Design a protein around this ligand. Structure first.
Ligand SMILES: *[C@@H]1O[C@H](CO)[C@@H](O[C@@H]2O[C@H](CO)[C@@H](O[C@@H]3O[C@H](CO[C@H]4O[C@H](CO)[C@@H](O)[C@H](O)[C@@H]4O)[C@@H](O)[C@H](O[C@H]4O[C@H](CO)[C@@H](O)[C@H](O)[C@@H]4O)[C@@H]3O)[C@H](O)[C@H]2NC(C)=O)[C@H](O)[C@H]1NC(C)=O
Ligand SMILES: *[C@@H]1O[C@H](CO)[C@@H](O[C@@H]2O[C@H](CO)[C@@H](O[C@@H]3O[C@H](CO)[C@@H](O)[C@H](O)[C@@H]3O)[C@H](O)[C@H]2NC(C)=O)[C@H](O)[C@H]1NC(C)=O
Ligand SMILES: *[C@@H]1O[C@H](CO)[C@@H](O[C@@H]2O[C@H](CO)[C@@H](O[C@@H]3O[C@H](CO)[C@@H](O)[C@H](O)[C@@H]3O)[C@H](O)[C@H]2NC(C)=O)[C@H](O)[C@H]1NC(C)=O
Ligand SMILES: *[C@@H]1O[C@H](CO)[C@@H](O[C@@H]2O[C@H](CO)[C@@H](O)[C@H](O)[C@H]2NC(C)=O)[C@H](O)[C@H]1NC(C)=O
Ligand SMILES: *[C@@H]1O[C@H](CO)[C@@H](O)[C@H](O)[C@H]1NC(C)=O
Ligand SMILES: *[C@@H]1O[C@H](CO)[C@@H](O)[C@H](O)[C@H]1NC(C)=O
Ligand SMILES: *[C@@H]1O[C@H](CO)[C@@H](O)[C@H](O)[C@H]1NC(C)=O
Ligand SMILES: *[C@H]1O[C@H](CO)[C@@H](O)[C@H](O)[C@H]1NC(C)=O
Ligand SMILES: [Cl-]
Ligand SMILES: [Cu+2]
Ligand SMILES: [Cu+2]
Ligand SMILES: [Cu+2]
Ligand SMILES: [Cu+2]
Length: 559
């Protein structure tokens, strides 16, 4: 609950809590709990926002997206998920939420829990809002979120720039007429398709029929508006821009950054940007454009011009008349110019490439299916019926190869990870790398070159050590692994648990592109509460009893 957060002073929140407070170690004791109930239903022949009827969707509370989770910094968010799907299990992951000492609430099936069984199965997630900003939630049951088990999270807190109006969430996502499981099967043997449409705040116009509506945002003239842009896609990576307006970035993912004014922004899958838009221009209707760069290396749409309308209050209605100029090609790369308000400093001169800190991503075309993504020689494949947490609770350390366990025993120390993007492979694609449970520091990446150029880079200490930044580098939960290159990340081992580190392109994580950071396993067992242990076991017993009756097999990694 705020006491000093005003339009002119957004830096202030409450006594002892402001924009400069280290949120990772200090949290407000509000004593408030915001509760929600997620009823997942399976709807056939559902009328979508662009007029096209989809074969099957999986919705939360009968809507395209679940409810917008709204709470204050320090509150506890509680969500009861009731799975009323016909066959599918489910697990809701709270993307961007660190789950500090609450690993069993991460929603990663086959890792932190067993899937919640269908036909009425339930589980109540409970997590502390130790970070303020814009995040999202989604199913981690294969590519199930591609069917509609998605939604947004807005944890209110201070900001790095004053603003008058909080316009709230603005989720932008790719939209396919085909269901997630059919698309997983397709992408296993074929190149990923372009999206049928791109929804902005749950709506879009059909490029063929003209049906549906554009997202309409009403701007109040002369005011500063906070817009929370999210990319909730399964594959599409977006470039966003507003005609005749600049966007001032105040947050990258769920991390507050110093004000950074730009003309356009690149949002990888899972990325978020809180921007401040000043309604400083002439009263008119302006196009908010969703474009693609990187020469289709990180997505495209069958809708050539996905857009939303930004209407100034008091101005006339109708469609905007200025098409604008195309934004700069971001080349499937997010900006490394963002600088977090609360700083972090790490040495980069001491980094040495070793097998134990290197994660080689590779596309294996030799097996069945054709598109199998391997990290350090193995495509991830979890056991929905026997999660990593079960191994921890039973004292079993014989983790199967397919779980891609990367055990990190270091206590509260900075660990360095070099991710290589199939340098010696036939072709390489950009990958939006996401980490559960932590925000990582983006120390550096291979030279920014055209995404479709097929130019390869292997980490060379002689020229690359000088290119790394350890003086308050970008801190976030998702960043781009350049096509054919490399990426150097670092995260402090302050959160014992089993944490997935994967590409957020649904087709790739389904295909096996992931590792599981088993962080401080010895400390994790001590921190698991009896309530969390009993409930984990309850859901697992219910899932294991359900599984043999399921008429469909597990066709992918399960993530
Ligand atoms: C979670 O819940 C979802 C929703 O029900 C399940 O998704 C279904 O999964 C099944 C099994 O994988 C899919 O069935 C298979 O579909 C293949 C493709 O068919 C689609 O595409 C073609 C071409 O566009 C269309 O003509 C067709 O109408 C479909 O849209 C078929 O090739 C498969 O056939 C073969 O296998 C079956 C099963 O063994 C045999 O009966 C056949 O004879 C043949 O050998 C098969 O039918 C289904 O398409 C998926 N539906 C959706 C909506 O995605 C998930 O499986 C479930 N997940 C779990 C783990 O429970
Ligand atoms: C996007 O949403 C805004 C806000 O709801 C819409 O703005 C509204 O536009 C209508 C016209 O379509 C305005 O109506 C007024 O009607 C009278 C009588 O016909 C006319 O004399 C006025 O000039 C005006 O057109 C209304 O005032 C306006 N509301 C605000 C607060 O600005 C906008 O139309 C929507 N855009 C789309 C494409 O849906
Ligand atoms: C931002 O989004 C808007 C809205 O989707 C885009 O406007 C669209 O612009 C295209 C051209 O770039 C228009 O299509 C063209 O129409 C002419 C007809 O004269 C035709 O000859 C061309 O072959 C092409 O089809 C389209 O009509 C227009 N949409 C609307 C409703 O105005 C805009 O281009 C986007 N801007 C950027 C920078 O991406
Ligand atoms: C990737 O797999 C390789 C095995 O091919 C791992 O390399 C071994 O790592 C251990 C340390 O745990 C060393 O004692 C061995 O000497 C290494 N063998 C090799 C290949 O030289 C490596 O740890 C794995 N990388 C990660 C981060 O998972
Ligand atoms: C979930 O929603 C469906 C459809 O509205 C309804 O039939 C069912 O009773 C609901 N289940 C629960 C437990 O909320
Ligand atoms: C997004 O859509 C919701 C529901 O239609 C609406 O209430 C909200 O104002 C929209 N957000 C913006 C910024 O237009
Ligand atoms: C330990 O885990 C392995 C892999 O799942 C399993 O084969 C073995 O039976 C387990 N040991 C026991 C009985 O706890
Ligand atoms: C954008 O729109 C304004 C409308 O007031 C137009 O006059 C202006 O020329 C446009 N901006 C530029 C310079 O492209
Ligand atoms: Cl996360
Ligand atoms: Cu996610
Ligand atoms: Cu996540
Ligand atoms: Cu990928
Ligand atoms: Cu994940």
């Amino acid at each position: 609950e705020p006491t000093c957060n005003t339009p002119s002073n957004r830096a202030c929140w409450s006594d002892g809590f402001d924009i400069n407070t280290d949120y990772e170690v200090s949290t407000p004791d509000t004593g408030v709990t915001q509760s929600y109930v997620f009823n997942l239903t399976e709807v056939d022949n559902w009328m979508g926002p662009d007029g096209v009827v989809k074969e099957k969707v999986m919705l939360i509370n009968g809507n395209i997206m679940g409810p917008n989770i709204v709470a204050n910094w320090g509150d506890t968010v509680e969500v009861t998920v009731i799975n009323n799907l016909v066959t599918n299990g489910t697990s809701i992951h709270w993307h961007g939420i660190h789950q500090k000492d609450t690993n069993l609430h991460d929603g990663a099936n086959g890792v932190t829990e067993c899937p919640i069984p269908p036909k009425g199965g339930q589980r109540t997630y409970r997590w502390r809002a130790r970070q303020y900003g814009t995040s999202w939630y989604h199913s981690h049951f294969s590519a199930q979120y591609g069917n509609g088990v998605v939604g947004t999270i807005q944890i209110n807190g201070p900001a790095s720039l004053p603003y008058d109006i909080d316009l709230g969430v603005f989720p932008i996502t790719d939209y396919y007429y085909r269901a997630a499981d059919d698309l997983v099967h397709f992408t296993q043997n074929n190149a990923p398709p372009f999206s049928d449409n791109v929804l902005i705040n749950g709506t879009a116009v059909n490029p063929n029929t003209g049906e549906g509506q554009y997202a309409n945002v009403t701007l109040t003239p002369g005011k500063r508006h906070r817009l929370r842009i999210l990319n909730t896609s399964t594959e599409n990576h977006f470039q966003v821009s507003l005609v005749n307006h600049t966007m001032t970035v105040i947050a990258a993912d769920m991390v507050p950054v110093n004000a950074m004014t730009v003309d356009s922004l690149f949002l990888a899958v899972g990325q978020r940007y809180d921007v401040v838009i000043d309604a400083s221009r002439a009263p008119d209707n302006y196009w908010f454009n969703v474009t693609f760069g990187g020469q289709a290396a990180c997505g495209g749409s069958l809708n050539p011009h996905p857009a939303a309308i930004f209407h100034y209050a008091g101005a006339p209605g109708g469609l905007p008349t200025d098409e604008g100029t195309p934004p700069v090609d971001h080349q499937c790369l997010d900006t490394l110019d963002v600088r977090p308000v609360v700083p972090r400093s790490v040495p980069v001169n001491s980094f040495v490439k070793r097998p134990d800190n290197t994660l080689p991503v590779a596309l294996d075309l030799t097996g069945t299916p054709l598109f199998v993504w391997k990290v350090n020689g193995s495509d991830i494949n979890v056991d929905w019926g026997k999660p990593i947490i079960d191994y921890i609770l039973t004292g079993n350390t014989s983790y199967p190869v397919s779980d891609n366990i990367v055990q990190v025993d270091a206590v509260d120390q900075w660990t360095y990870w070099l991710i290589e993007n199939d340098p010696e492979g036939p072709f390489s694609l950009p990958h939006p790398m996401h980490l559960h449970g932590h925000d990582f520091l983006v120390l550096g990446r291979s030279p920014d070159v055209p995404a479709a150029s097929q130019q390869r880079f292997v980490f060379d200490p002689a020229v690359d050590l000088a290119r790394l930044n350890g003086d308050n580098p970008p801190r976030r939960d998702t960043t781009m692994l350049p096509a054919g290159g490399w990426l150097l990340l670092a995260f402090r081992t302050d959160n014992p648990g089993a944490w997935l580190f994967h590409c957020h392109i649904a087709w790739h994580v389904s295909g096996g592109l992931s590792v599981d950071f088993l962080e401080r396993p010895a400390d994790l067992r001590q921190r698991i509460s009896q309530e969390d242990e009993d409930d984990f076991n309850r859901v697992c017993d219910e899932w294991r009893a359900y599984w043999p009756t399921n008429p469909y097999p597990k066709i992918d990694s399960g993530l």
